[PDB]
Write a protein that binds this ligand. Structure first.
Ligand code: HEC
Length: 108
């Protein structure tokens, strides 16, 4: 199914274990391997200030919402062929819902 609100509490733990190694969520957080995700929802892909993306990520030009984020996070490389995000995906729909619920709030 499409996105449905889950548990931000569980999503934060998922973020810590699966994402935090490469990403920050806070405005002005440290620079990492992946782009700062502050403000990601409602922004097009490839637009974080001062980050060097693949051409693939820029050219996809997806306007990130909670539904296409769930599709992307299922399998990043299938959604954006050639992306340099070294992440196979979140297989479980419940995990995607929980993570995205946390991410939507934490990146405000
Ligand atoms: C490093 C080992 C990473 C892990 C673990 C995760 N991400 Fe990532 N992400 C990473 C890179 C290097 C990039 C840039 C990709 C490119 O081709 O240029 C990304 C990109 C994203 C994006 C897109 C951001 C945009 O502005 O378009 C998102 C939304 C994203 N990453 C989210 C994300 C989440 C939620 C993770 C855990 C589940 C995660 N990433 C892991 C590097 C790495």
């Amino acid at each position: 199914a499409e996105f449905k609100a889950g548990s931000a509490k569980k999503g934060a733990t998922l973020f810590k274990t699966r994402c935090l190694q490469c990403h920050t969520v806070e405005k002005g957080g440290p620079h990492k391997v992946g782009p700062n995700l502050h403000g990601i929802f409602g922004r097009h892909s490839g637009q974080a200030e001062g980050y060097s993306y693949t051409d693939a990520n820029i050219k996809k030009n997806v306007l990130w919402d909670e539904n296409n984020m769930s599709e992307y996070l299922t399998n990043p490389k299938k959604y954006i062929p050639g992306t340099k995000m070294a992440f196979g995906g979140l297989k479980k729909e419940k995990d995607r819902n929980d993570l995205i619920t946390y991410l939507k709030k934490a990146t405000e």
